[PDB]
Amino acid sequence: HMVPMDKTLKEFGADVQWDDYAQLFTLIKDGAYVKVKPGAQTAIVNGQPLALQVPVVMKDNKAWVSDTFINDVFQSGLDQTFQVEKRPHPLNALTADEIKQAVEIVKASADFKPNTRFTEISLLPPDKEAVWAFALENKPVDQPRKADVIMLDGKHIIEAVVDLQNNKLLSWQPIKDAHGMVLLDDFASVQNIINNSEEFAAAVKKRGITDAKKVITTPLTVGYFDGKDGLKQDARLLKVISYLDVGDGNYWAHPIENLVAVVDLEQKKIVKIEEGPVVPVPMTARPFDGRDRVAPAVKPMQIIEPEGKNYTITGDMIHWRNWDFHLSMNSRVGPMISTVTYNDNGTKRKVMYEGSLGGMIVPYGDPDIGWYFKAYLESGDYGMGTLTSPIARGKDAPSNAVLLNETIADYTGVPMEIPRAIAVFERYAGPEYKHQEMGQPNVSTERRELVVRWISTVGNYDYIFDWIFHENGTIGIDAGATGIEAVKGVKAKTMHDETAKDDTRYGTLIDHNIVGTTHQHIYNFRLDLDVDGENNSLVAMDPVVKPNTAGGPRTSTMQVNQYNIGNEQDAAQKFDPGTIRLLSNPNKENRMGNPVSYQIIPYAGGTHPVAKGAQFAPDEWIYHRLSFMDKQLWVTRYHPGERFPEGKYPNRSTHDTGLGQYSKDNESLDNTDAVVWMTTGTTHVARAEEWPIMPTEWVHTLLKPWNFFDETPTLGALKKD
Amino acid sequence: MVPMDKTLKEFGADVQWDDYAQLFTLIKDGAYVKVKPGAQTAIVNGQPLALQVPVVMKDNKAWVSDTFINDVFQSGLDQTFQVEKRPHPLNALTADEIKQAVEIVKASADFKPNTRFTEISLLPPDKEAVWAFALENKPVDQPRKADVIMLDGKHIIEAVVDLQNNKLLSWQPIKDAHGMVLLDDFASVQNIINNSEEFAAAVKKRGITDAKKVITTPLTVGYFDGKDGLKQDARLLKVISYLDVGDGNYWAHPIENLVAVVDLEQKKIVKIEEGPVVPVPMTARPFDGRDRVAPAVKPMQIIEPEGKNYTITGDMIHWRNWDFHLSMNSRVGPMISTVTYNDNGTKRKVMYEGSLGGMIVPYGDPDIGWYFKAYLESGDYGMGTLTSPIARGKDAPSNAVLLNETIADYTGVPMEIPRAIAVFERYAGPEYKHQEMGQPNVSTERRELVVRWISTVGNYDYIFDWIFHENGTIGIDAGATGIEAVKGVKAKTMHDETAKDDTRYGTLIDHNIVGTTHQHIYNFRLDLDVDGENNSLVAMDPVVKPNTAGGPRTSTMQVNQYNIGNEQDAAQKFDPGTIRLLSNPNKENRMGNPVSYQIIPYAGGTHPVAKGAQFAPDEWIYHRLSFMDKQLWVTRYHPGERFPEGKYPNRSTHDTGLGQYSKDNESLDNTDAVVWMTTGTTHVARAEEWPIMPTEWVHTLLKPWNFFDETPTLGALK
Ligand SMILES: [Ca+2]
Ligand SMILES: [Ca+2]
Ligand SMILES: [Ca+2]
Ligand SMILES: [Ca+2]
Ligand SMILES: [Cu+2]
Ligand SMILES: [Cu+2]
């Protein structure tokens, strides 16, 4: 018995193309590029013949395949994109089994309690030195695989460490005063609490809402204001902003302004309701899904790699032209790029031990009741890894991409497989270099970049991160921002209405009765670069115009002030794109005697206005609790437990436990293991072109080899000597 | 019959044979053809075509009729190019018009025997008539005219000819102007050096044993108010030399501290400057792969099997909601004109004309062979003339369409540049996306149309991309690659004695070779007409203000908005944290906001950014080119103000570019404005850029700002 080709292949996730003239089917799926003619006894997979006992059968124009076609073809082995790992990499994320194992260990402990939730279950970082000897020398890690289990017992956080090898509990430590991040059940809880509240229902009714069941709530962190917001620091609270569901698939376009409920999650009740002036709910339908639009006509455009990919994925290790790296997922920060090396003519040179998103913040600038406290710690308070958005094949990533699946732990301790969690794709990026000497044959080569892309959606905002490995040693890190804007309901319909001026003091009027409140997206990346080795120093090279003292007609010259940045405190700074900042290896030089280095560029450009620091007066608390928002470059001594720019438990934090703390002691950065942190962001002043849905806006950052090599890096293998 | 491979390859089409399907896939620019041996039909961009003569398979080689190419590629099924029955008024001079304009000036009694042509281009009808032709099909009713700038010896003459009526309209000698460098000046300089005993002598002293291996490079010398000892009236060129060692890269063998000054009318060296003798770096440093072997790679193709989404009618390009005209100029290259955005059936004005305005590459070493180095690339060398033909699949992606363009050479003879510009659509990530939790995802792909042009000037190769986004945004990026201009030095490593002094003005990129620090400063002249001719420049500076509304916050995020009323105020530094708009005060979108375009001179770059001119305000190059120290400029529209550096920048003594255009500080309120964006790089070299430099890019953007009433790509409402 057989099945219908088209339906089965689409279900499977493969692209199916029929060519009536050639009587040929082209099937595409990740690294597999297949050709199959109806009735043929053979098929082609990445340029290679594959025998078929059961040929594709074309009936009354319907094609049918055998029930094993999918596996016989796609898992044949002719697609060599994915290979089996022999010796398990020490940085491999916890498997579904280990996740279950770690949860059983803790649930067997005498102190564990039944409603306990899990904010994070991740592999406990094996020691850096052993992981590199494994990557570079293949030495086995002789330490037991362990896992960090962060639990939320009601509102109390407990940190445990389980030994997975020996299956035992190593520690159980309650962490006083820390608040846990927001977990998925919190969302349903806030909704129900709102729905059962008689007073809220009454507040909504006096705002024109008739059917209280149509109210959509959203749970937001409240921050910390030393009590001026009149909130008890010890309670587990969330503020609640609501919208009216009108059926256009976008409740975000119908804000109920000036109504804020404060919910205490352990008490399961609304403990406070702030109300302001009544503003009619914008009711116009504003769908962004295309339901009310005409589908244009566009001709097909496909990027194809008919013989397979240039990279190979073994376990979680990716090898691609001279680069080698390990890629894993973390429920809080998303992807982690590790043990990154560059093969230089046979020798693998270290470039970066571990790289990932650090954290990010989205601070709003309106003082009203529904906005003064909005300053979202996306990853820290919401868990971006858990909120990963599955890639939509050919739209969110190019058609020649390979989509990876990743597994992490959900809040109850159960393994969760996120489909299409990360896209990996090679891409043409113009000429690598070119020289057309006049009268001579031209010289040009193409530039290839290997992109690792991951998307996370937090409520209304969708963030995209691309880790870009250029064949020449360069590494780019870009962040894209799209989604739906958080808007303010207002009475003005046009800038000509009486309240226009005041309605738009904190934002642009992007639709009738709707204002896109100004805010910023500030991202921070934690990059543990190891420039050709562990011991590095921070070097400054500032281009300057100095008076000429060499004679001849010129009055000035272009020279450079070169100096080392010796400690953490002076390494914490603003970045002038006119200058050069390097992470050099004072122990190793290139062929010309210069220290092998990487130039750090926290600001390479963007399509939205740039944030030059957080837009807050120095006396605001969000400005105090968090220091990472004001400097674009930070450099700290390596430490296994310093990974978040906003600190480990930022929800209602009262003091900086992040980059402000990691550099507070101002340690020496001279010839030592350094860790680089880049902060870049946008200042978002809205426009009508961004509603109902926002076009993707991007920010770029770069890491370039500076005298790390001796010559143009992609010139090619030397034919002589 | 004729061999298929041979004929197709001669034609420039790519041929792929698939043995499994017994199918040939042939591709050329917008044609994507499929044909099986023996089939009575073929497919061209998804449509069936009857063949007179089937493809025949001989001794495993395919043969086709001798009319195959014509029948298949020119059958009409490839709709990329359409006939232009009514020529746009900005269409460049054709080869017949160039020849004709040349005859008209040659027929005048003032034409002198060996006159050369620095530029012969179209003298366009007025702006208004051109927009009425584009928007209402109204015929311009003026004769086709051309500007013919002549160089008689060293004297510049500007004439104007009427092509229809075949008559000379004007002949005006231009006093004090120095002409641009012409091709023949290249061979005169080498020849003059070759015959100079004094020069051969200096070269001998420097180690060179065979003076026939010396490669000259002619450079403009600027102006130093006489401090360089050069006569202002003489047509001069300075000459830097290199030794050819057979590695195909003379640039890697500088003959440091040797400069000859050649007087092109006298045809002789009029001064020789000599400094410390530095042995010429000799090690072979080829960049063409003669000494290399590339690693094998799996193939990648970008195909559009049903053809392109864009159409090219004459020079008019149509794509999506965009419409624009593309023409070529010998001096600045490509010109994008009559750009409009079709908003739900109505064409709205965006830009009347946009192009590179001018660029400069000034150096920062004070020494004898470098102090005067400040090349006006397009102005002194002619970037359009120097266009570098696109290497298909490499300088541009495999799904591009390459265009040929024609201009006049220095002797007035038409010259056709093959693959002078590439046009190509590309995938650029998700246009927008929203994955609401628990609901079906929403994502659309972003498509951009790029217009790419490459110009090579001596050792440096410049790439320009004019990028039209489907959503109305327009990007302009500039890439720099090529070979660096290096200084010979004695140090081999930073451990040698002179290393410190040898690197004061540049990095030691190779043994005995320093990449002298310099800047790359580009300027784009963009006559934007935001929804109409009359616009105003409005600033919007995001600022932190005290909260006066109550609640716990001490501050708020607000905007300081105010008009920039005059040219002087419009000439300014650009803070990427602020917003600058070119608004149409007479038109507004649905919410009542003035329709505008946000101008961003600085959207990023891969090399350090030029904060301004790395020159003290009293340097001559600083005074001659005010455009280099301000990233944004806005002037009132004037047909003869087109170059940021001025019309005749060779040995200029004062600013005749943007400095002169804004001089009068006129009003920019509600009038025809022209925006100029200056963007650049400060280039401190590295070993990774030798012997050949990895392309570095700079990015600029023009974004619709309340020009529309909602997301421009949602589509028309059902
Ligand atoms: Ca520290
Ligand atoms: Ca490090
Ligand atoms: Ca204008
Ligand atoms: Ca003016
Ligand atoms: Cu935003
Ligand atoms: Cu340069």
Short mmCIF file of N, CA and C in Angstrom, two decimals, chain A residues 120-215:
data_model
loop_
_atom_site.label_atom_id
_atom_site.label_comp_id
_atom_site.label_asym_id
_atom_site.label_seq_id
_atom_site.Cartn_x
_atom_site.Cartn_y
_atom_site.Cartn_z
N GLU A 120 14.84 26.93 35.81
CA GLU A 120 15.92 26.63 34.89
C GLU A 120 16.62 25.33 35.31
N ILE A 121 16.84 24.45 34.32
CA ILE A 121 17.50 23.17 34.55
C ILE A 121 18.51 23.15 33.40
N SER A 122 19.78 23.37 33.64
CA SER A 122 20.77 23.38 32.58
C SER A 122 22.05 22.77 33.14
N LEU A 123 22.85 22.29 32.21
CA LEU A 123 24.13 21.68 32.49
C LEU A 123 24.94 22.72 33.28
N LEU A 124 25.63 22.16 34.27
CA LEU A 124 26.48 22.99 35.12
C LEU A 124 27.78 23.04 34.34
N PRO A 125 28.28 24.22 34.05
CA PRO A 125 29.50 24.40 33.28
C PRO A 125 30.74 23.63 33.71
N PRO A 126 31.15 22.63 32.95
CA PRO A 126 32.34 21.84 33.25
C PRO A 126 33.51 22.82 33.24
N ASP A 127 34.70 22.54 33.75
CA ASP A 127 35.73 23.57 33.70
C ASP A 127 36.33 23.87 32.34
N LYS A 128 36.31 25.17 32.07
CA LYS A 128 36.79 25.73 30.82
C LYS A 128 38.05 25.02 30.36
N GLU A 129 39.06 24.95 31.22
CA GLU A 129 40.29 24.28 30.77
C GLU A 129 40.10 22.86 30.29
N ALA A 130 39.26 22.06 30.94
CA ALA A 130 39.08 20.70 30.49
C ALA A 130 38.31 20.66 29.17
N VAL A 131 37.31 21.49 28.95
CA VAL A 131 36.53 21.56 27.74
C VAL A 131 37.45 21.96 26.57
N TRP A 132 38.43 22.84 26.75
CA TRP A 132 39.26 23.16 25.60
C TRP A 132 40.23 22.00 25.36
N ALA A 133 40.72 21.30 26.39
CA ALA A 133 41.65 20.22 26.10
C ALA A 133 40.85 19.14 25.36
N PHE A 134 39.56 19.08 25.66
CA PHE A 134 38.79 18.08 24.95
C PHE A 134 38.69 18.54 23.48
N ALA A 135 38.34 19.81 23.25
CA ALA A 135 38.20 20.25 21.87
C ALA A 135 39.45 20.28 21.01
N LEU A 136 40.56 20.68 21.60
CA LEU A 136 41.84 20.79 20.94
C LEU A 136 42.74 19.58 21.08
N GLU A 137 42.69 18.86 22.19
CA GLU A 137 43.57 17.70 22.33
C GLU A 137 42.76 16.42 22.43
N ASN A 138 41.44 16.51 22.45
CA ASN A 138 40.63 15.32 22.57
C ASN A 138 40.76 14.63 23.93
N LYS A 139 41.17 15.33 24.97
CA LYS A 139 41.28 14.71 26.27
C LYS A 139 39.89 14.64 26.90
N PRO A 140 39.49 13.49 27.39
CA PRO A 140 38.21 13.25 28.01
C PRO A 140 38.02 14.12 29.25
N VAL A 141 36.78 14.49 29.57
CA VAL A 141 36.55 15.32 30.73
C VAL A 141 36.34 14.33 31.87
N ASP A 142 37.24 14.32 32.83
CA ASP A 142 37.05 13.34 33.92
C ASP A 142 36.14 13.82 35.03
N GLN A 143 35.34 14.85 34.82
CA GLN A 143 34.48 15.30 35.92
C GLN A 143 33.08 14.86 35.59
N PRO A 144 32.30 14.53 36.61
CA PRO A 144 30.93 14.07 36.46
C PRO A 144 29.99 15.13 35.88
N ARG A 145 29.14 14.74 34.93
CA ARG A 145 28.18 15.63 34.31
C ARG A 145 27.25 16.07 35.45
N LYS A 146 27.07 17.37 35.58
CA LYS A 146 26.19 17.88 36.64
C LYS A 146 25.17 18.86 36.08
N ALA A 147 24.15 19.13 36.86
CA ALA A 147 23.15 20.06 36.36
C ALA A 147 22.68 21.01 37.44
N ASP A 148 22.40 22.23 37.04
CA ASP A 148 21.92 23.28 37.91
C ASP A 148 20.40 23.17 37.82
N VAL A 149 19.76 23.11 38.99
CA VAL A 149 18.30 23.01 39.02
C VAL A 149 17.79 24.18 39.86
N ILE A 150 17.22 25.18 39.18
CA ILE A 150 16.74 26.35 39.92
C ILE A 150 15.25 26.13 40.07
N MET A 151 14.82 26.13 41.34
CA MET A 151 13.42 25.90 41.60
C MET A 151 12.71 27.09 42.20
N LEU A 152 11.42 27.07 41.96
CA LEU A 152 10.58 28.15 42.51
C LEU A 152 9.59 27.41 43.41
N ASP A 153 9.67 27.57 44.73
CA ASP A 153 8.75 26.88 45.66
C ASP A 153 7.78 28.00 46.02
N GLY A 154 6.71 28.12 45.26
CA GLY A 154 5.79 29.23 45.56
C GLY A 154 6.53 30.48 45.05
N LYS A 155 7.08 31.33 45.93
CA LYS A 155 7.79 32.51 45.44
C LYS A 155 9.24 32.44 45.86
N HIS A 156 9.62 31.35 46.49
CA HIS A 156 11.01 31.23 46.94
C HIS A 156 11.92 30.41 46.03
N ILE A 157 13.05 31.03 45.73
CA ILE A 157 14.02 30.39 44.86
C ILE A 157 15.00 29.53 45.64
N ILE A 158 15.30 28.34 45.13
CA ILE A 158 16.22 27.42 45.71
C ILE A 158 17.13 26.97 44.58
N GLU A 159 18.42 26.93 44.81
CA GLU A 159 19.36 26.49 43.81
C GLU A 159 19.88 25.12 44.21
N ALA A 160 19.77 24.08 43.40
CA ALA A 160 20.27 22.73 43.68
C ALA A 160 21.26 22.32 42.58
N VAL A 161 22.09 21.36 42.91
CA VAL A 161 23.06 20.86 41.94
C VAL A 161 22.91 19.34 42.09
N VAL A 162 22.69 18.65 40.99
CA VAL A 162 22.53 17.21 40.93
C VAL A 162 23.72 16.65 40.16
N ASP A 163 24.22 15.49 40.56
CA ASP A 163 25.34 14.77 39.96
C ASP A 163 24.66 13.74 39.07
N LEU A 164 24.73 13.95 37.76
CA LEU A 164 24.05 12.99 36.89
C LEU A 164 24.79 11.67 36.70
N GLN A 165 26.09 11.70 36.76
CA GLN A 165 26.88 10.49 36.60
C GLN A 165 26.55 9.55 37.75
N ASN A 166 26.76 10.07 38.96
CA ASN A 166 26.49 9.27 40.16
C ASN A 166 25.06 9.36 40.66
N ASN A 167 24.17 10.03 39.94
CA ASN A 167 22.79 10.15 40.36
C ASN A 167 22.48 10.57 41.80
N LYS A 168 23.14 11.63 42.25
CA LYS A 168 22.88 12.08 43.60
C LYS A 168 22.84 13.61 43.66
N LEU A 169 22.21 14.10 44.71
CA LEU A 169 22.01 15.49 45.04
C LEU A 169 23.30 16.07 45.61
N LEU A 170 23.95 17.07 45.02
CA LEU A 170 25.17 17.60 45.60
C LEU A 170 24.92 18.78 46.51
N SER A 171 23.90 19.59 46.27
CA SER A 171 23.60 20.74 47.12
C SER A 171 22.15 21.18 46.92
N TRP A 172 21.63 21.91 47.89
CA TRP A 172 20.26 22.44 47.94
C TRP A 172 20.33 23.76 48.69
N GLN A 173 20.41 24.91 48.01
CA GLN A 173 20.50 26.20 48.66
C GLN A 173 19.43 27.25 48.40
N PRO A 174 18.64 27.58 49.41
CA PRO A 174 17.59 28.59 49.35
C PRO A 174 18.29 29.93 49.10
N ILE A 175 17.81 30.84 48.28
CA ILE A 175 18.41 32.13 47.93
C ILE A 175 17.37 33.15 48.39
N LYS A 176 17.80 33.78 49.49
CA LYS A 176 16.96 34.78 50.13
C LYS A 176 16.77 36.07 49.37
N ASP A 177 15.56 36.56 49.43
CA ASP A 177 15.18 37.80 48.78
C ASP A 177 15.14 37.73 47.26
N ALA A 178 15.62 36.63 46.64
CA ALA A 178 15.53 36.67 45.18
C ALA A 178 14.11 36.31 44.76
N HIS A 179 13.63 36.91 43.70
CA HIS A 179 12.35 36.70 43.06
C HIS A 179 12.64 35.81 41.83
N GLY A 180 11.75 34.91 41.45
CA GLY A 180 11.88 34.02 40.32
C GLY A 180 11.33 34.76 39.10
N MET A 181 11.82 34.30 37.95
CA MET A 181 11.32 34.98 36.72
C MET A 181 9.86 34.68 36.49
N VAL A 182 9.18 35.15 35.45
CA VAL A 182 7.77 34.84 35.21
C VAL A 182 7.67 33.48 34.51
N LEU A 183 6.81 32.54 34.90
CA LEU A 183 6.63 31.18 34.31
C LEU A 183 5.29 31.16 33.61
N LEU A 184 5.11 30.25 32.69
CA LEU A 184 3.91 30.21 31.85
C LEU A 184 2.65 30.12 32.70
N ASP A 185 2.62 29.39 33.77
CA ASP A 185 1.33 29.29 34.49
C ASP A 185 0.88 30.65 35.05
N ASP A 186 1.90 31.49 35.30
CA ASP A 186 1.62 32.84 35.80
C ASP A 186 0.68 33.55 34.82
N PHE A 187 0.84 33.31 33.52
CA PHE A 187 -0.02 33.97 32.55
C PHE A 187 -1.45 33.53 32.71
N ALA A 188 -1.66 32.21 32.80
CA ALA A 188 -3.05 31.78 32.95
C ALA A 188 -3.64 32.26 34.28
N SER A 189 -2.76 32.29 35.27
CA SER A 189 -3.24 32.73 36.60
C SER A 189 -3.73 34.17 36.60
N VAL A 190 -2.91 35.07 36.01
CA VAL A 190 -3.28 36.47 35.94
C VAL A 190 -4.62 36.60 35.23
N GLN A 191 -4.86 35.89 34.14
CA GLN A 191 -6.10 35.91 33.36
C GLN A 191 -7.32 35.50 34.17
N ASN A 192 -7.13 34.37 34.87
CA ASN A 192 -8.23 33.88 35.69
C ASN A 192 -8.58 34.84 36.83
N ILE A 193 -7.55 35.35 37.49
CA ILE A 193 -7.73 36.27 38.61
C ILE A 193 -8.51 37.48 38.14
N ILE A 194 -8.17 37.96 36.94
CA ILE A 194 -8.83 39.11 36.36
C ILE A 194 -10.27 38.72 36.10
N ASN A 195 -10.41 37.55 35.48
CA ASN A 195 -11.77 37.10 35.16
C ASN A 195 -12.67 36.84 36.36
N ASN A 196 -12.11 36.58 37.53
CA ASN A 196 -12.96 36.31 38.68
C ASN A 196 -13.14 37.59 39.51
N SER A 197 -12.36 38.64 39.27
CA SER A 197 -12.46 39.88 40.00
C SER A 197 -13.66 40.71 39.61
N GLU A 198 -14.48 40.89 40.66
CA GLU A 198 -15.72 41.64 40.51
C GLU A 198 -15.39 43.11 40.36
N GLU A 199 -14.41 43.56 41.10
CA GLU A 199 -14.10 44.98 40.96
C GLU A 199 -13.44 45.23 39.62
N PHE A 200 -12.59 44.29 39.20
CA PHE A 200 -12.01 44.64 37.87
C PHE A 200 -13.05 44.71 36.78
N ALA A 201 -13.99 43.78 36.89
CA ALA A 201 -15.05 43.72 35.89
C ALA A 201 -15.86 45.01 35.89
N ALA A 202 -15.93 45.56 37.11
CA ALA A 202 -16.69 46.81 37.22
C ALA A 202 -15.84 47.96 36.65
N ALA A 203 -14.52 47.92 36.85
CA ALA A 203 -13.66 48.97 36.33
C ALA A 203 -13.67 48.95 34.81
N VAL A 204 -13.70 47.77 34.22
CA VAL A 204 -13.72 47.59 32.77
C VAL A 204 -15.05 48.06 32.21
N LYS A 205 -16.12 47.78 32.95
CA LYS A 205 -17.42 48.23 32.43
C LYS A 205 -17.52 49.76 32.34
N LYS A 206 -16.96 50.48 33.29
CA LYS A 206 -17.02 51.93 33.28
C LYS A 206 -16.04 52.49 32.27
N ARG A 207 -15.50 51.64 31.42
CA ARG A 207 -14.55 52.03 30.39
C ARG A 207 -15.12 51.59 29.05
N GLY A 208 -16.44 51.42 29.07
CA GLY A 208 -17.10 51.00 27.83
C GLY A 208 -17.07 49.52 27.58
N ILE A 209 -16.29 48.71 28.31
CA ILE A 209 -16.35 47.29 27.96
C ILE A 209 -17.57 46.54 28.44
N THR A 210 -18.36 45.98 27.53
CA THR A 210 -19.55 45.24 27.98
C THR A 210 -19.26 43.79 28.35
N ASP A 211 -18.65 43.07 27.39
CA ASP A 211 -18.32 41.67 27.64
C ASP A 211 -16.92 41.48 28.23
N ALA A 212 -16.90 41.37 29.55
CA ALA A 212 -15.65 41.19 30.30
C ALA A 212 -14.88 39.94 29.88
N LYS A 213 -15.56 38.99 29.26
CA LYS A 213 -14.87 37.77 28.84
C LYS A 213 -13.93 38.02 27.66
N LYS A 214 -14.08 39.14 26.98
CA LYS A 214 -13.28 39.56 25.83
C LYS A 214 -12.02 40.35 26.20
N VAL A 215 -11.76 40.41 27.52
CA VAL A 215 -10.58 41.16 27.95
C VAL A 215 -9.31 40.32 27.93
#
